[PDB]
Design a protein around this ligand. Structure first.
Ligand SMILES: CCC(CC)O[C@@H]1CC(C(=O)O)=C[C@H](n2cc(C(C)(C)O)nn2)[C@H]1NC(C)=O
Ligand SMILES: CCC(CC)O[C@@H]1CC(C(=O)O)=C[C@H](n2cc(C(C)(C)O)nn2)[C@H]1NC(C)=O
Ligand SMILES: CCC(CC)O[C@@H]1CC(C(=O)O)=C[C@H](n2cc(C(C)(C)O)nn2)[C@H]1NC(C)=O
Ligand SMILES: CCC(CC)O[C@@H]1CC(C(=O)O)=C[C@H](n2cc(C(C)(C)O)nn2)[C@H]1NC(C)=O
Ligand SMILES: [Ca+2]
Ligand SMILES: [Ca+2]
Ligand SMILES: [Ca+2]
Ligand SMILES: [Ca+2]
Lengths: 388, 388, 388, 388
């Protein structure tokens, strides 16, 4: 039976911890995949952590990282949420240097992307077997969310980006039933830039938070109805949610256009509470260190700067990174709504630390109806390892 | 279907061994979690061993133990009873520096506790996904059993402690259905101190044995009816069941109040045989070395000193530690009653041994209708390891 | 539903290989349990390999073997047939320095034995939870088969030995339904000695082949009807099936009494083909080197010396050891009979080799209706390992 | 229920990647089986990777490879497609130095081959338990596909070769229901040589592509109707699909007889698109380096040289090896046809590289209705390892 996901996002006052896998700490002696870009999606029975590999291990010479990023040794694997990405608990998903994965009630539909950048290919597995494919339409680095995709009523929706990373690129919306592509749509958002979207189900539509690697220190926002009609723009909030960014006060904000004349970005998430927003960001405005999350009143609909709450999960004394969204099925939480949960990546090693490798651990948090305290649940490992 | 647990405790004449995992022996070469505070609960299909991690491994530098105890790297994981807590057989349960876990017939309800000590948070997972939360009400080290919780007819009951460890603290009783808190109650036991309760189902009520870290070398006792009405006090027995303690003869005992003017404690268990008690304790009265268990006649209802039986499981030549209670489901043992089974932790390393780490192995015993012989099933490993 | 096992043994002309786990070869780098006394039983869905542990690993210091044999660190674990006994694929069964395990159609009933030799205890687990116990009746090393037990129609039968190993001891027959002992019987076989029986289902009865560690180079034989009435004696065959033994020609044989004035023994198996026997033995008559199996015509009913076939599985250039019996469920093989299959242990290290440890690998063979060729499927590892 | 496999092969314009396991890269630190001859078959729920072992590990001394190839330590194990062949995720299948494995909808029927070359034995396991056997009929190296076998409507068909490798040998066709041999047939193909067939279901019949190790640089072709009536010969295409081979232009081709006066061969696959063929081969015509696949128009029925498409998967800068066929069940892909998917082995070490061992990793590709780009998904590991 198809997992409904038609209900609304739960109004939450805070986030209680879900998991922590300590893989880089475990991987000092264990057999752990050097991973990058973990993310969580849930089936109506369990939540798993996806990630990308080089087919290497921590403390190995194959973790030397000189081995490139967009590589053929790159695969998508999954483990259960909280388990580390180890060799002996991993489930193979796809050959992938960029991915998204999602469940619809029956089977897992994964979409890993590979090939050369000129003509990259994205394969849609479903039930484990590849079912369909999407080819590079623009010929510049075909890619997708790196976070959970979204199925509503058995139809799974997601967002891909073909084009350049700095200048204007092209952005699309795909739609599948049982791993077979049933629809697609182009995103006529000009001047704007959409990357690495964090998305979720909300009142029968798909809301996705994204990253502007062109000109925006604020974050793009897409709204997707199941007929692929769309409204797009930016998170109206007067708080810069991207990184690098500037001061909150030297920032006005816009619901339509990119603000803050900085380049670059980072993957980030947001959650729409009626008219308010749960926005997440790093503490450092220039680095990826720390992580915090703020509820900004009327920040979804207005260029607001009203911080209702400010909860800290990763301290600015510690390294973080990417972040993304997902929901808890009704068939799991017991609610009448969809519990907003999220993950934060914590990057260790290169380029910041004196090592030869680059991996990440995660912490997952999810939406509660109470106020959670500020603490730091950070990575832990004591670098450099023996290999370095 | 909800696991009944309304029946009475089996009258047992002894305890036959259930398991032994030898993880610290296995972990000389294997990949084993440096754990602390293991405990056993059973579903109507299997019994699992819970424990807490630092995300470290035996023989790793991450086992250096200087890494603190109430830490963010602390998680609750489980394995099957008898299996060691290894990376490749572990199931993630919660981020936890203090825990309890229990099954009700359908899903596992875990309750791990984390955060800062000032405002610690306890998350209730159920089916794997967090379902509810309890926040620090007193602002001093929110904590819970470290042993199995108890579900009766689909409602799961447990005991938490907010306050100080030496002086008077505050003690509460929680109640859940499907991971959603449905009740709570304060414990008006003054002068008394309740920590780390070992509990069980008995005639439709929950009996919990606890630890007095204030003034008692005897053990607190709580009786919980499913409406959260309670009687509380001490195990009436004239035998000191806590550690450190004194001689049995320089001990009178009380059914209401703390006896033996020693501080500190250790986690310990007891089992009520009609009017008698199966009480467990270490052999050494000052250290945690050894383990033994005595049936004291009428010791549940009277300040008795009549040892009916004395069975030894861990010898005073060997190290032990915590201990706790649980039952076997009717859906497993085949009985008409609930088989009393228990686990003993065996601590190796710091603070007693010349190492840099601290972990534990366990042995599990359960209630038989025969007299079992005295032997020592101890830890085994030959310390220090190579890392030290 | 209860697995029938009322049918007869398949008449087989040879044995085709089932498995080989190469654990000692795998365990040069892997994480493999130093085991002793492996054996195979099958459920109506799969066959597993049982074994006993010290909680040590190959190449570990904990494999030093000075660590004794009848030890508390001794456990019974299982893996699938062909898989090695590794830490990460092992299922905990019991604390055991002597064991038997069997399935009846619904759950696994294990019987591991432990304690001190004076008052050893045998616990009956069933479904994973201990269900019943048998205590030392004679006070000298309580022990059992080390090979599969036998369930017929939901009742499981086996053979235990309390007494001395050299002189006359005492031998019993137990019977269980759902892990609860429902019957027992003493074996009034005087002068004779019964150890480590290899048993099986045959026409509604249980036939067990055993070892005479007193005075016999031939092998005891027990026949068990499900009311525990018994006929006992020796395998009538004029071929000595035990080891150490003598020449076949300096051996007459007896269907009642022990022949060949040698002491000691080894665990061994046999299979009754109507009136013939498939008897197995080592090639060396003094050491445990090699393994071969001979069909002796009318050897079950008469003191025959007619070798119908002689198949070799382990060559006399290579080390072997114990051996034992089991059947394939109809629910697996598809037959109308019960396929005779067997395992051979291959011991490496101490006492024969220049190492510090002692483990074993296995090969499994089962009954086919064709003539299989003589080859050597031996252990493989290249000793001594790095630890030595 | 029996998996139908009566439908036709999907007409495909290209192949999108299925998996990559990077075991030799993982096995720099992990526990990975030194394997040879991997292959993929799928059940109506999952696809697994089969392989053969020495019971050794990467980076072990037991990987020294001086240990021979046709050895008793040789086993057939399986893992899921994309997972590496590691000790802790492996399922034991058979003792095998040559194999085939296939699923019919209900259980796995494996056929591993062992023994001495003079009188080798092939055992048919089914459901895990050995069910039947085929003995060496010619007395020279009994062997089979090393690739997936084929079940159609519950009857499983495959191809064995008894005889010599260079000169004329003998070739047979077997047929099983539930692991019990129900039919057999001799292949009266004279002058011709058939080895290591890659086969598949196509319109109710079994088409198998093979290797000519005698005189052919082109590839034999067998067509099997379920009554074991056969047509046999060669892939009519004017393109040499074997290796070593010669130029395409110095090659005429034949639909009946072996062309290109070279000896040797390599395992290879083909797929019949109505009248066209998807033929695969290495890039190097003399070595096993590289891999590419060409659709040759009317190449199944005519000595054509019309390359419709040329897709590259492994570049000639990198090592490859064997290759073989299989299908995706309708119960997996969702199609009305049978999706043509294939695997390529990538050999590292001896005999080409400066190591002491020999293993392989794989990539799997499957049939899509789009044109896939040329990229290299190669092995990765950086040789020699530490052991060498
Ligand atoms: C901005 C979106 C893409 C465009 C190529 O760049 C991602 C940026 C980025 C970062 O550090 O911020 C890491 C991401 N990333 C992904 C990876 C691999 C290792 C290929 O998975 N390495 N880096 C970029 N995504 C790619 C290369 O496909
Ligand atoms: C007396 C109850 C608590 C109050 C903080 O102290 C526990 C005592 C204790 C011991 O050695 O006896 C070990 C327990 N403990 C638990 C832990 C960790 C590693 C945090 O799980 N370390 N020690 C204490 N529980 C805590 C700190 O939450
Ligand atoms: C003859 C039957 C028993 C009587 C104690 O002796 C077994 C003999 C034997 C051998 O080498 O032949 C190995 C068996 N054995 C078993 C074990 C352990 C390691 C205790 O499982 N070590 N050796 C003996 N069984 C025991 C000690 O319980
Ligand atoms: C040509 C078919 C057979 C005839 C013996 O030879 C296979 C050739 C071959 C190669 O390199 O091309 C590798 C194959 N092979 C297989 C193996 C083992 C390690 C026995 O599985 N080693 N090599 C050959 N098959 C055998 C020996 O049973
Ligand atoms: Ca930006
Ligand atoms: Ca105390
Ligand atoms: Ca003897
Ligand atoms: Ca050739």
């Amino acid at each position: 039976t198809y997992m409904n996901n038609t209900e609304a996002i739960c109004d939450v006052k805070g986030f209680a911890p879900f998991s922590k896998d300590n893989g880089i700490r475990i991987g000092s002696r264990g057999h752990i995949f050097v991973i990058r870009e973990p993310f969580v999606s849930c089936s109506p029975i369990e939540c798993r952590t996806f990630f990308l590999t080089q087919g290497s291990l921590l403390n190995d010479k194959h973790s030397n990282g000189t081995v490139k990023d967009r590589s053929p040794f790159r695969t998508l694997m999954s483990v259960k949420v909280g388990q580390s990405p180890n060799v002996y608990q991993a489930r193979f998903e796809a050959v992938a240097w960029s991915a998204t994965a999602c469940h619809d009630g029956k089977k897992w539909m994964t979409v890993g992307v590979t090939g050369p950048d000129s003509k990259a290919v994205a394969v849609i597995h479903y039930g484990g077997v590849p079912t369909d494919v999407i080819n590079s339409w623009a010929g510049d680095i075909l890619r997708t969310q790196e976070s959970s995709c979204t199925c509503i009523q058995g139809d799974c929706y997601w967002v891909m980006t073909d084009g350049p990373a700095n200048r204007q690129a092209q952005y699309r919306i795909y739609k599948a039933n049982q791993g077979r592509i049933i629809g697609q749509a182009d995103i006529s958002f000009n001047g704007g830039h959409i990357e690495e979207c964090s998305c979720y189900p909300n009142d029968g539509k798909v809301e996705c938070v994204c990253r502007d690697n062109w000109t925006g220190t604020n974050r793009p926002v897409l709204v997707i109805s199941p007929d692929l009609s769309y409204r797009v723009g930016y998170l109206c909030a007067g708080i810069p949610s991207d990184t690098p960014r500037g001061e909150d006060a030297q920032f006005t904000g816009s619901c339509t256009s990119p603000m803050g004349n900085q380049g670059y970005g980072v993957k980030g998430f947001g959650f729409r509470q009626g008219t308010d927003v749960w926005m997440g960001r790093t503490i450092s405005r220039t680095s990826r260190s720390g992580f915090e999350i703020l509820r900004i009143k009327n920040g979804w609909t207005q260029t607001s700067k009203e911080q209702v709450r400010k909860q800290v999960v990763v301290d600015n004394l510690n390294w973080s990174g990417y972040s993304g969204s997902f929901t808890l099925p009704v068939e799991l939480s017991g609610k009448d709504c969809l519990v907003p949960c999220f993950w934060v990546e914590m990057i260790r090693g290169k380029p910041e630390e004196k090592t030869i490798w680059t991996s990440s651990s995660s912490i997952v948090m999810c939406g509660v109806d109470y106020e959670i305290a500020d603490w730091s649940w950070h990575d832990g490992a004591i670098l450099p390892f023996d290999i370095d």
